[PDB]
Design an enzyme around this catalytic site. Structure first.
Site, PDB file in Angstrom:
ATOM      1  N   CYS B  65      36.634  35.789  38.629  1.00 11.49           N
ATOM      2  CA  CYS B  65      36.900  37.095  37.994  1.00 11.49           C
ATOM      3  C   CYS B  65      35.624  37.874  37.615  1.00 11.49           C
ATOM      4  CB  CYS B  65      37.749  36.902  36.715  1.00 11.49           C
ATOM      5  SG  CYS B  65      38.134  38.445  35.878  1.00 11.49           S
ATOM      6  N   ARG B  68      35.261  39.633  33.546  1.00 13.96           N
ATOM      7  CA  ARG B  68      35.215  38.770  32.361  1.00 13.96           C
ATOM      8  C   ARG B  68      34.453  39.260  31.120  1.00 13.96           C
ATOM      9  NH1 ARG B  68      33.256  33.223  34.508  1.00 13.96           N
ATOM     10  NH2 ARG B  68      32.685  34.347  36.472  1.00 13.96           N
ATOM     11  N   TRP B 237      43.272  45.699  34.265  1.00 13.56           N
ATOM     12  CA  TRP B 237      43.388  46.871  35.116  1.00 13.56           C
ATOM     13  C   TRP B 237      42.775  46.517  36.465  1.00 13.56           C
ATOM     14  CZ3 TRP B 237      40.793  47.158  30.352  1.00 13.56           C
ATOM     15  CH2 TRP B 237      39.409  46.941  30.434  1.00 13.56           C
ATOM     16  N   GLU B 242      40.506  46.363  45.233  1.00 17.29           N
ATOM     17  CA  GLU B 242      41.661  45.472  45.419  1.00 17.29           C
ATOM     18  C   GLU B 242      42.771  46.229  46.129  1.00 17.29           C
ATOM     19  OE1 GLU B 242      42.554  42.716  41.982  1.00 17.29           O
ATOM     20  OE2 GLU B 242      41.481  44.372  40.952  1.00 17.29           O
TER      21      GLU B 242
HETATM   22  C1  HEM Z   1      40.356  43.842  32.586  1.00 14.19           C
HETATM   23  C2  HEM Z   1      40.337  44.076  33.923  1.00 14.19           C
HETATM   24  C3  HEM Z   1      40.155  43.039  34.979  1.00 14.19           C
HETATM   25  C4  HEM Z   1      39.540  43.269  36.158  1.00 14.19           C
HETATM   26  C5  HEM Z   1      39.000  44.623  36.638  1.00 14.19           C
HETATM   27  C6  HEM Z   1      39.551  42.065  36.903  1.00 14.19           C
HETATM   28  C7  HEM Z   1      39.055  41.956  38.221  1.00 14.19           C
HETATM   29  C8  HEM Z   1      39.352  40.866  39.053  1.00 14.19           C
HETATM   30  C9  HEM Z   1      39.207  40.823  40.487  1.00 14.19           C
HETATM   31  C10 HEM Z   1      38.745  41.957  41.387  1.00 14.19           C
HETATM   32  C11 HEM Z   1      39.563  39.590  40.928  1.00 14.19           C
HETATM   33  C12 HEM Z   1      39.551  39.119  42.390  1.00 14.19           C
HETATM   34  C13 HEM Z   1      40.932  39.353  43.009  1.00 14.19           C
HETATM   35  C14 HEM Z   1      41.084  39.197  44.513  1.00 14.19           C
HETATM   36  O1  HEM Z   1      40.098  39.180  45.291  1.00 14.19           O
HETATM   37  O2  HEM Z   1      42.259  39.081  44.977  1.00 14.19           O
HETATM   38  C15 HEM Z   1      39.917  38.836  39.772  1.00 14.19           C
HETATM   39  C16 HEM Z   1      40.290  37.503  39.865  1.00 14.19           C
HETATM   40  C17 HEM Z   1      40.795  36.860  38.734  1.00 14.19           C
HETATM   41  N1  HEM Z   1      40.901  37.367  37.460  1.00 14.19           N
HETATM   42 FE1  HEM Z   1      40.316  39.058  36.752  1.00 14.19          FE
HETATM   43  N2  HEM Z   1      40.149  41.091  36.205  1.00 14.19           N
HETATM   44  C18 HEM Z   1      40.511  41.584  34.999  1.00 14.19           C
HETATM   45  C19 HEM Z   1      41.225  40.957  33.973  1.00 14.19           C
HETATM   46  C20 HEM Z   1      41.678  39.637  34.002  1.00 14.19           C
HETATM   47  C21 HEM Z   1      42.431  39.005  32.998  1.00 14.19           C
HETATM   48  C22 HEM Z   1      42.933  39.704  31.747  1.00 14.19           C
HETATM   49  C23 HEM Z   1      42.569  37.654  33.362  1.00 14.19           C
HETATM   50  C24 HEM Z   1      43.268  36.571  32.631  1.00 14.19           C
HETATM   51  C25 HEM Z   1      43.488  36.562  31.292  1.00 14.19           C
HETATM   52  C26 HEM Z   1      41.919  37.508  34.647  1.00 14.19           C
HETATM   53  C27 HEM Z   1      41.813  36.327  35.379  1.00 14.19           C
HETATM   54  C28 HEM Z   1      41.434  36.341  36.736  1.00 14.19           C
HETATM   55  C29 HEM Z   1      41.684  35.151  37.570  1.00 14.19           C
HETATM   56  C30 HEM Z   1      42.295  33.826  37.145  1.00 14.19           C
HETATM   57  C31 HEM Z   1      41.291  35.463  38.813  1.00 14.19           C
HETATM   58  C32 HEM Z   1      41.352  34.524  40.028  1.00 14.19           C
HETATM   59  C33 HEM Z   1      42.768  34.484  40.641  1.00 14.19           C
HETATM   60  C34 HEM Z   1      42.861  33.581  41.862  1.00 14.19           C
HETATM   61  O3  HEM Z   1      42.094  32.618  42.032  1.00 14.19           O
HETATM   62  O4  HEM Z   1      43.726  33.783  42.730  1.00 14.19           O
HETATM   63  N3  HEM Z   1      41.366  38.717  34.976  1.00 14.19           N
HETATM   64  N4  HEM Z   1      39.777  39.616  38.620  1.00 14.19           N
HETATM   65  N1  LIG Z   2      42.358  43.448  38.490  1.00 14.00           N
HETATM   66  C1  LIG Z   2      42.782  42.147  38.452  1.00 14.00           C
HETATM   67  C2  LIG Z   2      42.997  41.473  37.247  1.00 14.00           C
HETATM   68  C3  LIG Z   2      43.431  40.138  37.258  1.00 14.00           C
HETATM   69  C4  LIG Z   2      43.641  39.503  38.486  1.00 14.00           C
HETATM   70  C5  LIG Z   2      44.058  38.173  38.569  1.00 14.00           C
HETATM   71  C6  LIG Z   2      44.253  37.556  39.808  1.00 14.00           C
HETATM   72  C7  LIG Z   2      44.027  38.280  40.970  1.00 14.00           C
HETATM   73  C8  LIG Z   2      44.206  37.657  42.326  1.00 14.00           C
HETATM   74  C9  LIG Z   2      45.579  37.859  42.906  1.00 14.00           C
HETATM   75  N2  LIG Z   2      45.480  37.543  44.371  1.00 14.00           N
HETATM   76  C10 LIG Z   2      45.498  36.085  44.609  1.00 14.00           C
HETATM   77  C11 LIG Z   2      45.519  35.784  46.113  1.00 14.00           C
HETATM   78  C12 LIG Z   2      46.784  36.379  46.677  1.00 14.00           C
HETATM   79  C13 LIG Z   2      48.007  35.848  46.297  1.00 14.00           C
HETATM   80  C14 LIG Z   2      49.194  36.394  46.792  1.00 14.00           C
HETATM   81  C15 LIG Z   2      49.147  37.477  47.661  1.00 14.00           C
HETATM   82  C16 LIG Z   2      47.920  37.999  48.027  1.00 14.00           C
HETATM   83  F1  LIG Z   2      47.877  39.038  48.864  1.00 14.00           F
HETATM   84  C17 LIG Z   2      46.730  37.462  47.541  1.00 14.00           C
HETATM   85  C18 LIG Z   2      43.610  39.609  40.897  1.00 14.00           C
HETATM   86  C19 LIG Z   2      43.402  40.208  39.660  1.00 14.00           C
HETATM   87  N3  LIG Z   2      42.974  41.490  39.620  1.00 14.00           N
HETATM   88 CL   LIG Z   3      46.941  43.073  43.926  1.00 15.14          CL
END
Ligand code: HEM
Ligand SMILES: Nc1ccc2ccc(CCNCCc3cccc(F)c3)cc2n1
Ligand SMILES: [Cl-]
Ligand code: HEM
Ligand SMILES: Nc1ccc2ccc(CCNCCc3cccc(F)c3)cc2n1
Ligand SMILES: Nc1ccc2ccc(CCNCCc3cccc(F)c3)cc2n1
Ligand SMILES: Nc1ccc2ccc(CCNCCc3cccc(F)c3)cc2n1
Ligand SMILES: [Cl-]
Lengths: 362, 362
Positions: B65, B68, B237, B242
């Site tokens: 993420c 963070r 958000w 994405e």
């Molecule tokens: C506040 C705005 C936030 C932004 C802009 C943001 C941005 C992102 C982005 C761009 C990704 C990569 C997603 C992808 O490539 O599919 C990501 C992954 C992730 N984010 Fe964040 N995020 C935010 C908030 C959060 C929150 C609130 C949580 C949990 C409390 C969180 C937990 C994660 C996790 C667990 C992943 C990895 C998911 C996976 O492995 O499939 N994020 N985030």
């Molecule tokens: N902006 C944010 C915030 C929190 C997030 C938390 C997790 C994710 C990753 C979601 N994608 C996981 C991989 C996946 C799973 C299922 C369908 C897909 F197209 C891709 C994106 C986030 N983006």
């Molecule tokens: Cl999405």
């Protein structure tokens, strides 16, 4: 003991090399010959066939290289016969000329005598045979920052750069026995450069950007069957993003994005306008256009990834494991538009291969 | 034995959590209480303070993420009291409303009762609470391909989609004891969507693209001190890439680049024109513009990386090791324009964290 590492590597390379060359029956006798050559001499000498195929395998095994489809057509020049600095110099000049090939770039490697006792016979100081100097003093930055330390070392040796942004560094290398390297100015007739223009933005030429035609990496060690060829410069053609997304774009390199944005007529004030992204795309279009217009080989990152997909398919067909470094294989612009981004790669090191070695200066 | 894993995780989480909360003196007694609660009950129950801080730590430890920096301002809703499907439904509706906040998105997590015996109390089938259906039959592709299997499972349960490209999937979840999940149509009044327009290419609206305002990931397990909260939907958000570089761009998703190229008036014939790259930049500009124009929170990838740099700095200042997954942290457009690309990250898994779990369908 070092005789042991050598012998082990030799057995493994000779077996693999000869299998691939359809020469599997000749292995036993060849290994026998090598075995006693090692005992009597401490080392062994590759046949021309072994050295050529070894260099090609080393390219095939280069995890970070997207251009590997063409591994088997590498042009291998055997210069293990050189003994003098004039011969080394002329071999390097020759490599430039033949690799350039009037713009129709030939992937080529020139192989110099290998390390003996871990003692280098020829030690090349250049990172690439053609590269621009860099200067930093008094908060004044000129040329390529990545060349600053080599530039300063050259100027310790009596060379002086003109301090344009595109001074060509001289060839610089040291011969076994000599305390200092010698340097030789590149003949400008040998060096193709490409001015960067844009296909439809006429003001782009106002940036007065250019880059050289051929990347000839000259500071890596080629390792083949336990033999260490520390001096073995090689080249391909460029993938355009190397120039337009990194050499000309990086803040620690030529740092041109703000100037690009201005000449393409877009504001560079707000991150949300994605002006850096737009600037990057236009600069990269300009680089591909300019190379093509001048008849110098280049590949765009989409075509390159498509070739690499064919390399993956060919590896599978041949029964070879594919290895790769995802973090270097993805291009630095639109990576998720390539298949590379959407799969993973085993980053194991397989030999023969090319390796980093410590710089002789700094 | 499972009592053992639990107790170990508990000791480690409570110690760390209380240190961070300036409550280090209360650890011994709290661990004593937990120790006998585990013996007598098989499990233990987090205090509200522990659960809140645990969810925040889990975000802080999410290697993939980029967002963070804001870990400590996560809005944590404690719904461990729910017992019925109507309560779960209303909690999910509430999460949507409060997280959306009329467009000024609040990062929020709603935490449901944890697994007991490894037995789920509430099992959410949705990938995100708001997501579009996908259909494939007779070589006919409609909607989001990534939703195909969940869409088909919903239609097994008596739901029927309208087969637009943007059908909202119903909430679908199963309660402990029930053989089948139930599903509920989302109230359209709760769901903000953003039509995609471009700041200066008026024809862009001809693509009739849209996306939903808030990504609310609802299929990951939150693990805190040995307790497994398999149902704990959370949201931030969006980062614009994405949507514009992946959801709308990927060939296996909405696959819109060729249509984008056409409406922006560029040819899509030659790789060397970098038309996909240009299309990507314009689509991504359009997404940021559209969200901003509608007053829905979003971040561009440059600003996001700058925030993440501050997160790295803050980690160092606090004496915490930073962990990260370089392959997910780099944005899919102009990654080398961010500092992330130019450094490495330790991809170790630290708990509390969020984890994948097996889908209950397919
Ligand atoms: C506040 C705005 C936030 C932004 C802009 C943001 C941005 C992102 C982005 C761009 C990704 C990569 C997603 C992808 O490539 O599919 C990501 C992954 C992730 N984010 Fe964040 N995020 C935010 C908030 C959060 C929150 C609130 C949580 C949990 C409390 C969180 C937990 C994660 C996790 C667990 C992943 C990895 C998911 C996976 O492995 O499939 N994020 N985030
Ligand atoms: N902006 C944010 C915030 C929190 C997030 C938390 C997790 C994710 C990753 C979601 N994608 C996981 C991989 C996946 C799973 C299922 C369908 C897909 F197209 C891709 C994106 C986030 N983006
Ligand atoms: Cl999405
Ligand atoms: C024919 C055209 C070629 C193309 C288009 C090509 C493309 C590339 C690119 C883009 C990189 C990544 C560079 C970076 O990010 O800085 C690379 C790395 C590399 N290529 Fe190739 N390449 C080609 C030919 C060759 C040849 C002929 C060899 C050797 C015989 C070679 C060996 C390597 C090696 C060793 C690396 C990694 C270097 C390092 O780790 O620093 N390539 N290639
Ligand atoms: N097109 C090609 C062909 C062969 C190549 C072989 C190697 C390389 C990588 C060269 N860059 C290595 C890292 C580095 C070293 C020194 C200065 C830098 F700016 C960057 C690029 C290549 N590109
Ligand atoms: N859905 C998504 C979102 C972001 C992604 C970002 C990256 C990738 C690449 C998958 N290749 C991973 C390379 C890798 C990963 C982890 C460890 C390694 F050694 C190598 C897939 C993605 N899928
Ligand atoms: N000069 C260059 C050229 C290409 C590059 C491509 C990628 C990088 C990123 C460095 N971060 C590496 C992440 C990584 C690498 C290797 C193993 C890992 F686990 C993680 C730096 C580059 N530098
Ligand atoms: Cl280069």
């Amino acid at each position: 003991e070092e005789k042991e590492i050598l012998w082990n590597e030799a057995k493994a390379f000779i077996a693999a090399c000869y299998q691939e060359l359809g020469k599997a029956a000749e292995v036993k006798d060849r290994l026998a010959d090598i075995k006693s050559e090692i005992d009597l001499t401490g080392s062994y000498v590759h046949t021309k066939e072994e050295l050529e195929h070894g260099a090609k395998m080393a390219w095939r095994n280069s995890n970070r290289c997207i251009g590997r489809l063409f591994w088997n057509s590498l042009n291998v020049i055997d210069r293990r016969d050189v003994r003098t600095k004039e011969e080394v110099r002329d071999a390097l000049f020759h490599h430039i000329e033949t690799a350039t090939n009037n713009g129709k770039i030939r992937p080529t490697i020139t192989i110099f005598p290998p390390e003996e006792k871990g003692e280098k016979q020829v030690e090349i100081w250049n990172h690439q045979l053609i590269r621009y100097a860099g200067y930093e003093s008094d908060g004044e930055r000129i040329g390529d920052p990545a060349s600053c330390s080599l530039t300063a070392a050259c100027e310790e040796l009596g060379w002086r750069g003109e301090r344009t942004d595109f001074d060509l560094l001289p060839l610089i290398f040291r011969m076994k026995g000599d305390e200092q390297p010698v340097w030789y100015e590149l003949p400008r007739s040998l060096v193709i450069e490409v001015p960067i223009t844009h296909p439809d933005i006429e003001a782009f030429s106002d940036l007065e950007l250019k880059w050289y035609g051929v990347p000839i990496i000259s500071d890596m060690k080629l390792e083949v069957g336990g033999i260490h060829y520390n001096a073995a410069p090689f080249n391909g053609w460029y993938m355009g993003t190397e120039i337009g997304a990194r050499n000309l774009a990086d803040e620690k390199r030529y740092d041109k994005l703000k100037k690009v944005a201005s000449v393409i007529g877009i504001a560079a004030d707000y991150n949300t306008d994605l002006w850096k992204d737009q600037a990057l795309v236009e600069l990269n279009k300009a680089v591909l256009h300019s190379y093509k217009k001048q008849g110098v080989s280049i590949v765009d990152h989409h075509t390159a990834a498509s070739q690499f997909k064919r390399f993956e398919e060919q590896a599978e067909e041949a029964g070879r494991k594919l290895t790769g470094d995802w973090t270097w294989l993805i291009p630095p612009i639109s990576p998720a538009a390539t298949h590379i981004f959407h799969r993973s790669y085993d980053n194991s090191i397989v030999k023969p291969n090319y390796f980093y070695q410590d710089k002789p200066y700094e």
